[PDB]
Amino acid sequence: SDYGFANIEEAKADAIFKLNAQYHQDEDPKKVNMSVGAYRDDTGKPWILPAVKKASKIVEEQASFNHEYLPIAGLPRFTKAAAEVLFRPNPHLLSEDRVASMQSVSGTGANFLAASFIETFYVKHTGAHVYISNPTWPVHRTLWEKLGVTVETYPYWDAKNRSFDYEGMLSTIKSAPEGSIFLLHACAHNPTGIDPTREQWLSIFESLLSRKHLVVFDIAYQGFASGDLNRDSWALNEFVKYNKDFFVCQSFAKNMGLYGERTGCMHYVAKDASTKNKVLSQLCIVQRNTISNPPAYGARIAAEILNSPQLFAEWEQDLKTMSSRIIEMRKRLRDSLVALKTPGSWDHITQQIGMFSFTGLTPAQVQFCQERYHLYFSANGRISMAGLNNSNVEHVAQAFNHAVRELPL
């Protein structure tokens, strides 16, 4: 202001933040927030996983417990265990010392690490662009653009068929310049919820390799999506068979409910230990000059679970609890729309997976739901299934039924 800062333009309101403001001002007792991006139980409350609560109690009583700095790359028994749970069918990647793992400030910080590294050591001399799904998590675009990488998209949501636009994605893969960067969702695509089949994945991998593209997997919902850890990491482990180095950005925010503790890991899967160590040393330079070292509390908890056979088994029970409740809400919503004979097909509701769903509603229909049924969710029709429970799912189905019947497109 003695320095020109009053000339700055104040930034536009965050998308999620402005919806939340409107939800909170609504005075109707039947209102529902269907934009919450975190798991909720059947009463609509945050839910601490019993295994996580148990692990944090165990950790706090340990004689060695303290608040001292971690190594720059993070807590070693966390980074090692985080890689192991991704690659249970491929333990040789760890034992051959081929995975460079950096504990990160959750999934977003892992993406920031990978993108910073890839921009400096790949984009600089190749001019490659990064390709993200259309639609995707909106930070995927701005995070990469802020680091100076040009962002392109590949088609993903086929709105007419309410399904995955396999042919559009494949066509973009084949026509993109060789050696482009492709940001892939490992499972439970955000925001649509619809994943490629295994058959579609194999064809996707074939074309990615034929064009020599560089692959970055984002895996934010392993185990949380299906309750089965190896099923949810299937695409990652299938890609290992092709013997191309690649990157993985991993979050424990949802599958351990650690959200605000910021527990994640970035991995580079090298072809040999020598390159693993070259890359790791450069990743440490980025880490040193952004955060210095990562937060310990969530990592200690995750390492405790992952390295204990009994806590691991109890965590898998908690994953089953969460994934089953979402599946049950998807079934309830779809079953009510079928019973109400709502125009259109509604099987995409149960063919999708994870806590986000592209419903297929239009902006007019979403606005109708907001004004007449006090449902708050995104204009593109994305809902969070976590907001749905036994007390409101019939109200939600009735709203959708009315909106679609009243406002056909």
Next chain:
Amino acid sequence: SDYGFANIEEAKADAIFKLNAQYHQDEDPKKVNMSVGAYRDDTGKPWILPAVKKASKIVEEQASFNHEYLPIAGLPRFTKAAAEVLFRPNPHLLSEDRVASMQSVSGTGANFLAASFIETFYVKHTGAHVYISNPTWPVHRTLWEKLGVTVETYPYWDAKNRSFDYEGMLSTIKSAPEGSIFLLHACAHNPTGIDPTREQWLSIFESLLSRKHLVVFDIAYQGFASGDLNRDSWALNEFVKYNKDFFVCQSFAKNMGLYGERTGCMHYVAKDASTKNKVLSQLCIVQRNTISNPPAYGARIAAEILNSPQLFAEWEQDLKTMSSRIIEMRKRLRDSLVALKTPGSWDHITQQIGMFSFTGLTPAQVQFCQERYHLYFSANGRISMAGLNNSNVEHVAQAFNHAVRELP
């Protein structure tokens, strides 16, 4: 590697890391780690502050405790109280809604936030360089250079007088281009430990004001340094009188022992609420595109202490415990060097404050201390007092005495 990554050259190890590796390989029973980057108690061990142990139990036993996402700018009860403890003499800054406060990944993350914002909204319009003390924490230079700002230095360590180079710093402030960026240490200068006196600060501020420089304060040791929170933030609050907007990067790593939980805050002290809100909205964009939101555990602990009068009083006792122990070690070391009649003057050991000290030892004397007395510290003579205690301080004094006498 199918992508050219085998052509990357492996970065060389950090000097501190390589030093610690050498310390732990040394089998000599009298070895001392003089490079510990964190507080240690009188027995050489990590030390959880009693108030922090109490605060964390209170936090986790609270009925509403959970692990949910914080807002982009962090836990409001933390960021408000983090500003309050900096500006206790100046409560009008908060009541007029003039402080934009962003919870960060400790002091490093606060610095990254401040530097990213200043590069984007100040440096690219003015061409300003940032001036850091010579010496300073080495990440200050690389953090700013990585973001595209040219880094200059101002003189700080007077090696011949073993003191603060006031005239050199003042001369650089006066000759730097108008509108330059100056990174200042609020108290307990890292790595020398020597601070400007209050009268030197007043003259420093006048010259900064007359050249219209932009000021960024780093405050990583408030309360930890002297045991007195308001004394340690005196320079911050004195600068408030000059009515220029400015930045503060705050860390709770040392003063709450929260090191690995990564608890800190960046503040922009605006002239008015309008610009405060403009800057804050741009800070949130940077934060959204790097970490999304900051880690909750340490911030909840800090907010519990800072918002409770009784816990705050307990924490102030822990601050007295830590600062007193470091002062006593400095006194023990200084008094032994005086009694050993070690050539040179050693009052700088007790005129410095905080955990880090420039000893004045030469590289050959430091190397002598490592090989003959198994003391591990930096070749510029910087030591950490945290590793000193009753079991080894006399060994350290005798090493310095021998090193200085043998290598004049």
